[PDB]
Amino acid sequence: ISTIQPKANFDAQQFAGTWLLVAVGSACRFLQEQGHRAEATTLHVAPQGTAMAVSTFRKLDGICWQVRQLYGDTGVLGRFLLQARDARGAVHVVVAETDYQSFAVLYLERAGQLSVKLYARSLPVSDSVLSGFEQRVQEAHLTEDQIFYFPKYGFCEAADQFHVLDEV
Amino acid sequence: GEWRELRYDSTCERLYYGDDEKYFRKPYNFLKYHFEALADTGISSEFYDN
């Protein structure tokens, strides 16, 4: 395990609003098999103190769902702890390489393993940025084979009262 | 019969059901306890006007 630098002079009101997931880099089993249950995943973000309040949205078996979490800040700008809500413990979230207008690369960590995500404000991404994500995966010592490019269409937002996990 | 309970995992992006409380231990004083899911509803409405 190792340290990667969070976004220097980060601003939470610039990360706010909607985002769409392009890809995930991880050694995790449930992507290298069962990957047909990768689905079109998007975020709404709103700042709450130095922490970021996060809603993820996804289709679970044709029904649109919402997932609610705090990126509770560690007291270091651009680092957050996922509020330790369940028996898996806590996940560290580090915003690694971004511009608020187009793209974000995140690192997420548990059990001494790094993992990474690429997000965009709108559906396509520039090949240099996507190559940057591949290099961040290689620099995380993961293979490009451990990169999973999520469904490029059919996203959803605003799930009903009964389709939100309320995990916080 | 109700163990099914949703969980997200933020690392590797999965939505999965908890695998918690799948079984309960039965006390010796209980012969059978059965976790059968039923509903029945019955509704009657009557209106009379003169």
PDB file of C-alpha atoms in Angstrom:
ATOM      1  CA  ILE A   1       0.000   0.000   0.000  1.00  0.00           C
ATOM      2  CA  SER A   2       1.125   3.629  -0.763  1.00  0.00           C
ATOM      3  CA  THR A   3       0.073   7.343  -0.789  1.00  0.00           C
ATOM      4  CA  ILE A   4      -1.146   9.273  -3.873  1.00  0.00           C
ATOM      5  CA  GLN A   5      -1.611  13.063  -3.745  1.00  0.00           C
ATOM      6  CA  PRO A   6      -5.175  14.494  -3.379  1.00  0.00           C
ATOM      7  CA  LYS A   7      -6.173  17.438  -5.662  1.00  0.00           C
ATOM      8  CA  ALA A   8      -4.139  20.504  -4.610  1.00  0.00           C
ATOM      9  CA  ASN A   9      -6.400  23.425  -3.507  1.00  0.00           C
ATOM     10  CA  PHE A  10      -9.642  21.406  -4.200  1.00  0.00           C
ATOM     11  CA  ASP A  11     -13.096  23.148  -4.113  1.00  0.00           C
ATOM     12  CA  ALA A  12     -16.212  21.160  -3.117  1.00  0.00           C
ATOM     13  CA  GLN A  13     -18.675  23.662  -4.697  1.00  0.00           C
ATOM     14  CA  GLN A  14     -16.853  23.045  -8.038  1.00  0.00           C
ATOM     15  CA  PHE A  15     -17.269  19.217  -7.748  1.00  0.00           C
ATOM     16  CA  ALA A  16     -21.049  19.661  -7.038  1.00  0.00           C
ATOM     17  CA  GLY A  17     -23.923  18.644  -9.407  1.00  0.00           C
ATOM     18  CA  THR A  18     -24.149  15.626 -11.794  1.00  0.00           C
ATOM     19  CA  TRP A  19     -21.413  13.147 -12.920  1.00  0.00           C
ATOM     20  CA  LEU A  20     -21.410   9.895 -15.003  1.00  0.00           C
ATOM     21  CA  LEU A  21     -19.109   6.874 -14.503  1.00  0.00           C
ATOM     22  CA  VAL A  22     -16.976   5.851 -17.491  1.00  0.00           C
ATOM     23  CA  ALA A  23     -14.833   3.092 -15.951  1.00  0.00           C
ATOM     24  CA  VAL A  24     -13.501   1.281 -12.823  1.00  0.00           C
ATOM     25  CA  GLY A  25      -9.997  -0.167 -12.242  1.00  0.00           C
ATOM     26  CA  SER A  26      -9.865  -2.947  -9.583  1.00  0.00           C
ATOM     27  CA  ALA A  27      -8.677  -6.512  -8.798  1.00  0.00           C
ATOM     28  CA  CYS A  28     -12.209  -7.246  -7.382  1.00  0.00           C
ATOM     29  CA  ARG A  29     -13.774 -10.636  -8.319  1.00  0.00           C
ATOM     30  CA  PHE A  30     -17.313  -9.293  -8.976  1.00  0.00           C
ATOM     31  CA  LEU A  31     -16.070  -7.342 -12.059  1.00  0.00           C
ATOM     32  CA  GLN A  32     -13.870 -10.090 -13.673  1.00  0.00           C
ATOM     33  CA  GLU A  33     -16.990 -12.320 -13.368  1.00  0.00           C
ATOM     34  CA  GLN A  34     -20.702 -11.263 -13.136  1.00  0.00           C
ATOM     35  CA  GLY A  35     -19.715  -8.143 -15.230  1.00  0.00           C
ATOM     36  CA  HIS A  36     -23.046  -8.350 -17.159  1.00  0.00           C
ATOM     37  CA  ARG A  37     -24.418  -6.676 -13.950  1.00  0.00           C
ATOM     38  CA  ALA A  38     -22.351  -3.566 -14.669  1.00  0.00           C
ATOM     39  CA  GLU A  39     -25.070  -0.893 -15.211  1.00  0.00           C
ATOM     40  CA  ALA A  40     -25.177   2.822 -16.146  1.00  0.00           C
ATOM     41  CA  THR A  41     -24.063   4.640 -12.889  1.00  0.00           C
ATOM     42  CA  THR A  42     -24.247   8.425 -12.214  1.00  0.00           C
ATOM     43  CA  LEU A  43     -23.707  10.730  -9.166  1.00  0.00           C
ATOM     44  CA  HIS A  44     -25.323  13.829  -7.683  1.00  0.00           C
ATOM     45  CA  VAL A  45     -22.941  15.682  -5.293  1.00  0.00           C
ATOM     46  CA  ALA A  46     -23.680  18.452  -2.758  1.00  0.00           C
ATOM     47  CA  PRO A  47     -21.161  19.882  -0.174  1.00  0.00           C
ATOM     48  CA  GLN A  48     -22.051  19.545   3.555  1.00  0.00           C
ATOM     49  CA  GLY A  49     -19.347  21.217   5.658  1.00  0.00           C
ATOM     50  CA  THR A  50     -15.904  20.127   4.318  1.00  0.00           C
ATOM     51  CA  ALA A  51     -17.496  16.701   3.574  1.00  0.00           C
ATOM     52  CA  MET A  52     -19.272  15.925   0.257  1.00  0.00           C
ATOM     53  CA  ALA A  53     -22.779  14.378   0.392  1.00  0.00           C
ATOM     54  CA  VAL A  54     -22.995  11.764  -2.408  1.00  0.00           C
ATOM     55  CA  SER A  55     -25.941  10.156  -4.122  1.00  0.00           C
ATOM     56  CA  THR A  56     -25.034   7.393  -6.624  1.00  0.00           C
ATOM     57  CA  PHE A  57     -27.807   6.216  -9.028  1.00  0.00           C
ATOM     58  CA  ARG A  58     -28.084   2.862 -10.888  1.00  0.00           C
ATOM     59  CA  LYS A  59     -30.630   0.496 -12.528  1.00  0.00           C
ATOM     60  CA  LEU A  60     -30.947  -2.672 -10.395  1.00  0.00           C
ATOM     61  CA  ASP A  61     -32.721  -5.210 -12.678  1.00  0.00           C
ATOM     62  CA  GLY A  62     -34.649  -2.505 -14.602  1.00  0.00           C
ATOM     63  CA  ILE A  63     -35.696  -0.621 -11.405  1.00  0.00           C
ATOM     64  CA  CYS A  64     -33.895   2.697 -10.801  1.00  0.00           C
ATOM     65  CA  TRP A  65     -32.144   2.948  -7.395  1.00  0.00           C
ATOM     66  CA  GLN A  66     -30.341   5.668  -5.418  1.00  0.00           C
ATOM     67  CA  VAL A  67     -27.513   5.103  -2.933  1.00  0.00           C
ATOM     68  CA  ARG A  68     -26.676   7.785  -0.303  1.00  0.00           C
ATOM     69  CA  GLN A  69     -23.297   8.207   1.368  1.00  0.00           C
ATOM     70  CA  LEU A  70     -21.125  10.874   3.061  1.00  0.00           C
ATOM     71  CA  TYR A  71     -17.640  11.474   1.803  1.00  0.00           C
ATOM     72  CA  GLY A  72     -16.898  12.602   5.399  1.00  0.00           C
ATOM     73  CA  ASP A  73     -13.630  14.605   5.248  1.00  0.00           C
ATOM     74  CA  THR A  74     -10.477  13.328   7.024  1.00  0.00           C
ATOM     75  CA  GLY A  75      -9.546  16.987   7.767  1.00  0.00           C
ATOM     76  CA  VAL A  76      -7.200  16.859   4.702  1.00  0.00           C
ATOM     77  CA  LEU A  77      -8.579  18.674   1.647  1.00  0.00           C
ATOM     78  CA  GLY A  78      -9.629  16.159  -1.089  1.00  0.00           C
ATOM     79  CA  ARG A  79      -9.584  13.057   1.259  1.00  0.00           C
ATOM     80  CA  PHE A  80     -12.690  11.370   2.752  1.00  0.00           C
ATOM     81  CA  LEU A  81     -13.529   8.291   4.937  1.00  0.00           C
ATOM     82  CA  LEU A  82     -17.023   6.944   3.840  1.00  0.00           C
ATOM     83  CA  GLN A  83     -18.348   7.240   7.481  1.00  0.00           C
ATOM     84  CA  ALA A  84     -17.635   3.561   8.552  1.00  0.00           C
ATOM     85  CA  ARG A  85     -21.378   2.586   8.187  1.00  0.00           C
ATOM     86  CA  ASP A  86     -21.204  -1.274   7.909  1.00  0.00           C
ATOM     87  CA  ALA A  87     -19.097  -4.357   8.901  1.00  0.00           C
ATOM     88  CA  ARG A  88     -16.701  -3.903   5.882  1.00  0.00           C
ATOM     89  CA  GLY A  89     -15.349  -0.928   7.918  1.00  0.00           C
ATOM     90  CA  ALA A  90     -14.403   2.333   6.151  1.00  0.00           C
ATOM     91  CA  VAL A  91     -13.218   3.197   2.590  1.00  0.00           C
ATOM     92  CA  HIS A  92     -10.736   6.021   1.962  1.00  0.00           C
ATOM     93  CA  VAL A  93     -11.705   8.232  -1.041  1.00  0.00           C
ATOM     94  CA  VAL A  94      -8.949  10.363  -2.688  1.00  0.00           C
ATOM     95  CA  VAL A  95      -9.638  12.757  -5.633  1.00  0.00           C
ATOM     96  CA  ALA A  96      -6.429  12.246  -7.643  1.00  0.00           C
ATOM     97  CA  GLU A  97      -6.614  14.023 -11.041  1.00  0.00           C
ATOM     98  CA  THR A  98      -9.513  16.217 -12.212  1.00  0.00           C
ATOM     99  CA  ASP A  99     -10.982  19.289 -13.777  1.00  0.00           C
ATOM    100  CA  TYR A 100     -14.403  20.314 -12.491  1.00  0.00           C
ATOM    101  CA  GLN A 101     -15.704  21.127 -16.006  1.00  0.00           C
ATOM    102  CA  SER A 102     -15.056  17.721 -17.701  1.00  0.00           C
ATOM    103  CA  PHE A 103     -13.492  14.797 -15.777  1.00  0.00           C
ATOM    104  CA  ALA A 104     -12.569  13.234 -12.430  1.00  0.00           C
ATOM    105  CA  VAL A 105     -10.210  10.375 -11.498  1.00  0.00           C
ATOM    106  CA  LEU A 106     -10.709   8.993  -7.976  1.00  0.00           C
ATOM    107  CA  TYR A 107      -8.775   6.440  -5.940  1.00  0.00           C
ATOM    108  CA  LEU A 108     -10.746   4.337  -3.391  1.00  0.00           C
ATOM    109  CA  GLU A 109      -9.043   2.064  -0.816  1.00  0.00           C
ATOM    110  CA  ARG A 110      -9.850  -0.860   1.526  1.00  0.00           C
ATOM    111  CA  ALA A 111      -8.024  -3.942   2.949  1.00  0.00           C
ATOM    112  CA  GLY A 112      -4.600  -2.661   1.687  1.00  0.00           C
ATOM    113  CA  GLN A 113      -5.877  -2.666  -1.967  1.00  0.00           C
ATOM    114  CA  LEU A 114      -6.220   0.443  -4.161  1.00  0.00           C
ATOM    115  CA  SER A 115      -9.043   0.830  -6.711  1.00  0.00           C
ATOM    116  CA  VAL A 116      -9.830   3.670  -9.186  1.00  0.00           C
ATOM    117  CA  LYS A 117     -12.741   5.335 -11.051  1.00  0.00           C
ATOM    118  CA  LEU A 118     -13.137   7.653 -14.076  1.00  0.00           C
ATOM    119  CA  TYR A 119     -16.113  10.047 -14.232  1.00  0.00           C
ATOM    120  CA  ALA A 120     -17.244  12.722 -16.711  1.00  0.00           C
ATOM    121  CA  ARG A 121     -19.829  15.579 -16.814  1.00  0.00           C
ATOM    122  CA  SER A 122     -21.136  14.325 -20.229  1.00  0.00           C
ATOM    123  CA  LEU A 123     -21.148  10.962 -22.045  1.00  0.00           C
ATOM    124  CA  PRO A 124     -17.836  10.805 -24.100  1.00  0.00           C
ATOM    125  CA  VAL A 125     -14.230  11.359 -22.843  1.00  0.00           C
ATOM    126  CA  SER A 126     -11.053  12.546 -24.636  1.00  0.00           C
ATOM    127  CA  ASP A 127      -8.603   9.722 -25.557  1.00  0.00           C
ATOM    128  CA  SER A 128      -5.716  11.506 -23.732  1.00  0.00           C
ATOM    129  CA  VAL A 129      -7.823  11.615 -20.500  1.00  0.00           C
ATOM    130  CA  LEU A 130      -8.822   7.939 -20.888  1.00  0.00           C
ATOM    131  CA  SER A 131      -5.120   7.113 -21.526  1.00  0.00           C
ATOM    132  CA  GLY A 132      -4.384   9.082 -18.314  1.00  0.00           C
ATOM    133  CA  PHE A 133      -6.816   6.795 -16.448  1.00  0.00           C
ATOM    134  CA  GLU A 134      -5.070   3.711 -17.964  1.00  0.00           C
ATOM    135  CA  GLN A 135      -1.699   5.121 -16.794  1.00  0.00           C
ATOM    136  CA  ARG A 136      -3.157   5.791 -13.285  1.00  0.00           C
ATOM    137  CA  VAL A 137      -4.286   2.102 -13.289  1.00  0.00           C
ATOM    138  CA  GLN A 138      -0.780   0.960 -14.379  1.00  0.00           C
ATOM    139  CA  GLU A 139       0.754   3.284 -11.701  1.00  0.00           C
ATOM    140  CA  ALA A 140      -1.621   1.621  -9.165  1.00  0.00           C
ATOM    141  CA  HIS A 141       0.167  -1.643 -10.326  1.00  0.00           C
ATOM    142  CA  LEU A 142      -3.181  -2.923 -11.751  1.00  0.00           C
ATOM    143  CA  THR A 143      -3.506  -4.329 -15.299  1.00  0.00           C
ATOM    144  CA  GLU A 144      -5.517  -2.604 -18.043  1.00  0.00           C
ATOM    145  CA  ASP A 145      -7.406  -5.965 -18.075  1.00  0.00           C
ATOM    146  CA  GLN A 146      -8.622  -4.946 -14.567  1.00  0.00           C
ATOM    147  CA  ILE A 147     -10.337  -1.885 -16.187  1.00  0.00           C
ATOM    148  CA  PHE A 148     -14.098  -2.250 -16.734  1.00  0.00           C
ATOM    149  CA  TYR A 149     -15.822   0.298 -19.005  1.00  0.00           C
ATOM    150  CA  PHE A 150     -19.413   0.695 -17.759  1.00  0.00           C
ATOM    151  CA  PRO A 151     -22.576   1.004 -19.971  1.00  0.00           C
ATOM    152  CA  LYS A 152     -22.309   4.129 -22.182  1.00  0.00           C
ATOM    153  CA  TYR A 153     -26.114   4.768 -22.324  1.00  0.00           C
ATOM    154  CA  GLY A 154     -29.410   4.306 -20.399  1.00  0.00           C
ATOM    155  CA  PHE A 155     -28.493   6.190 -17.164  1.00  0.00           C
ATOM    156  CA  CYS A 156     -31.168   7.156 -14.587  1.00  0.00           C
ATOM    157  CA  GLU A 157     -31.613   9.785 -11.826  1.00  0.00           C
ATOM    158  CA  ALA A 158     -34.302  10.557  -9.152  1.00  0.00           C
ATOM    159  CA  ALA A 159     -35.244   7.065  -7.851  1.00  0.00           C
ATOM    160  CA  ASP A 160     -38.514   6.710  -5.857  1.00  0.00           C
ATOM    161  CA  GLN A 161     -38.940   6.806  -2.036  1.00  0.00           C
ATOM    162  CA  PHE A 162     -38.630   2.989  -1.761  1.00  0.00           C
ATOM    163  CA  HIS A 163     -35.562   2.710  -4.014  1.00  0.00           C
ATOM    164  CA  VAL A 164     -33.046   4.670  -1.884  1.00  0.00           C
ATOM    165  CA  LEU A 165     -30.681   2.813   0.518  1.00  0.00           C
ATOM    166  CA  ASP A 166     -30.309   5.694   3.101  1.00  0.00           C
ATOM    167  CA  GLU A 167     -26.804   4.437   4.149  1.00  0.00           C
ATOM    168  CA  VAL A 168     -25.323   7.957   4.878  1.00  0.00           C
TER     169      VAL A 168
ATOM    170  CA  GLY B   1     -37.658 -15.819   4.939  1.00  0.00           C
ATOM    171  CA  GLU B   2     -36.821 -12.058   4.977  1.00  0.00           C
ATOM    172  CA  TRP B   3     -32.963 -12.072   5.110  1.00  0.00           C
ATOM    173  CA  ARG B   4     -32.834 -10.300   1.705  1.00  0.00           C
ATOM    174  CA  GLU B   5     -31.501  -6.783   2.471  1.00  0.00           C
ATOM    175  CA  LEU B   6     -29.639  -4.436   0.019  1.00  0.00           C
ATOM    176  CA  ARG B   7     -26.037  -3.172   0.471  1.00  0.00           C
ATOM    177  CA  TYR B   8     -23.820  -1.087  -1.838  1.00  0.00           C
ATOM    178  CA  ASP B   9     -20.099  -1.622  -2.207  1.00  0.00           C
ATOM    179  CA  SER B  10     -18.400   1.567  -3.352  1.00  0.00           C
ATOM    180  CA  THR B  11     -15.113  -0.218  -4.135  1.00  0.00           C
ATOM    181  CA  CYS B  12     -15.732  -2.252  -7.320  1.00  0.00           C
ATOM    182  CA  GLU B  13     -19.243  -0.814  -7.811  1.00  0.00           C
ATOM    183  CA  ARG B  14     -21.723  -3.590  -6.835  1.00  0.00           C
ATOM    184  CA  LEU B  15     -25.236  -3.719  -5.345  1.00  0.00           C
ATOM    185  CA  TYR B  16     -25.671  -6.934  -3.440  1.00  0.00           C
ATOM    186  CA  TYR B  17     -27.784  -8.412  -0.617  1.00  0.00           C
ATOM    187  CA  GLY B  18     -26.295  -8.540   2.854  1.00  0.00           C
ATOM    188  CA  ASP B  19     -25.929 -12.272   3.773  1.00  0.00           C
ATOM    189  CA  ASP B  20     -26.719 -11.233   7.406  1.00  0.00           C
ATOM    190  CA  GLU B  21     -29.467 -12.778   9.619  1.00  0.00           C
ATOM    191  CA  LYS B  22     -30.051 -15.706   7.138  1.00  0.00           C
ATOM    192  CA  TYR B  23     -30.663 -18.066  10.124  1.00  0.00           C
ATOM    193  CA  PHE B  24     -32.048 -17.784  13.650  1.00  0.00           C
ATOM    194  CA  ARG B  25     -31.403 -20.281  16.512  1.00  0.00           C
ATOM    195  CA  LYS B  26     -34.664 -21.821  17.848  1.00  0.00           C
ATOM    196  CA  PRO B  27     -35.158 -22.177  21.643  1.00  0.00           C
ATOM    197  CA  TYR B  28     -35.857 -25.753  22.848  1.00  0.00           C
ATOM    198  CA  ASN B  29     -39.338 -24.725  24.078  1.00  0.00           C
ATOM    199  CA  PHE B  30     -40.464 -23.990  20.468  1.00  0.00           C
ATOM    200  CA  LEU B  31     -41.412 -27.109  18.458  1.00  0.00           C
ATOM    201  CA  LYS B  32     -41.660 -25.309  15.087  1.00  0.00           C
ATOM    202  CA  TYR B  33     -41.372 -21.679  13.943  1.00  0.00           C
ATOM    203  CA  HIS B  34     -41.912 -21.394  10.207  1.00  0.00           C
ATOM    204  CA  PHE B  35     -41.299 -18.037   8.431  1.00  0.00           C
ATOM    205  CA  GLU B  36     -44.236 -18.443   6.034  1.00  0.00           C
ATOM    206  CA  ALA B  37     -45.051 -15.217   4.105  1.00  0.00           C
ATOM    207  CA  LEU B  38     -48.798 -14.627   3.691  1.00  0.00           C
ATOM    208  CA  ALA B  39     -51.071 -11.696   3.095  1.00  0.00           C
ATOM    209  CA  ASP B  40     -54.802 -11.599   3.091  1.00  0.00           C
ATOM    210  CA  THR B  41     -56.848  -8.422   2.750  1.00  0.00           C
ATOM    211  CA  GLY B  42     -60.586  -8.034   2.738  1.00  0.00           C
ATOM    212  CA  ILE B  43     -62.388  -4.799   1.928  1.00  0.00           C
ATOM    213  CA  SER B  44     -66.100  -4.065   1.982  1.00  0.00           C
ATOM    214  CA  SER B  45     -67.665  -0.711   1.131  1.00  0.00           C
ATOM    215  CA  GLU B  46     -71.385   0.016   1.129  1.00  0.00           C
ATOM    216  CA  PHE B  47     -73.139   3.278   0.298  1.00  0.00           C
ATOM    217  CA  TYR B  48     -76.898   3.945   0.437  1.00  0.00           C
ATOM    218  CA  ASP B  49     -78.586   7.266  -0.358  1.00  0.00           C
ATOM    219  CA  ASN B  50     -82.212   8.432  -0.382  1.00  0.00           C
TER     220      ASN B  50
END
